[PDB]
């Protein structure tokens, strides 16, 4: 059984994260209160995944779709019939209150930013290969010529205007923040990227100390953070849809398909 196979253990990421709260709810929804959820981090969990995959050792992680892990590995979602992880998750483009009128040109670009999951992986994979994000961003924009035209449609050039982009250091958001960062730099902007945790990121935006962020995962991941700063930020675009999250096992675990299978 799945309980037999993993010793009632889920390998997760960092404790302060959205997927970890959501998992807490999951374990509670499916009556898994004798299970152990290991907190770790992205780096640590993906390493533990690597060990177990190679050995064909059964493992249950907390996975999220917009990530290179589904590329480097044959993985799968355990079905969530109780939808503990919510649904219709999206990546959003947020700014500080009154950025759109302070800088109409920069907001135009930010609101027009869209791309797909594998287009983001185009970047994420090269970065995990050890390529420098700023180089991969440049390579990307000088490759996907038509996509940038979409984004920069009716967008003027500026004389060294300053812009502060706040990002949370998940691999997905290193992808997006750099690509957009580069687009702005090609446009003649003085671009700063400020790294922060989620929370400090939301605060920075809500208190004007950062201009924009491409790290808002709504509505499920940052339910609380979005609520907390309800009338104090701008949501000016969706940069991606169909992002999924939950319990992920490798495909070799044929007999484990639902979270329900853990009750056995
Ligand atoms: C799903 N994630 C791992 C990726 C971005 C948000 C983060 C989380 O808080 O769960």
From Swiss-Prot:
Protein origin, superkingdom: Bacteria
PROSITE patterns: PROKAR_LIPOPROTEIN
GO molecular function per UniProt: transmembrane transporter activity
Entry keywords, A to Z: Amino-acid transport, Cell membrane, Lipoprotein, Membrane, Palmitate, Signal, Transport
Pfam families for the chain: OpuAC
InterPro entries registered for this protein in UniProt: ABC_Gly_betaine_transp_sub-bd
Localization annotation: Cell membrane; Membrane raft
Keyword Acyltransferase on entry: no
GO cellular component: ATP-binding cassette (ABC) transporter complex; membrane raft
Protein name, per record: Glycine betaine-binding protein OpuAC
Topology class, membrane: Lipid-anchor
Function: Involved in a multicomponent binding-protein-dependent transport system for glycine betaine.
GO biological process, one term: amino acid transport
Location, primary (coarse class): membrane
Subunit record text: The complex is composed of two ATP-binding proteins (OpuAA), two transmembrane proteins (OpuAB) and a solute-binding protein (OpuAC). Interacts with FloT.
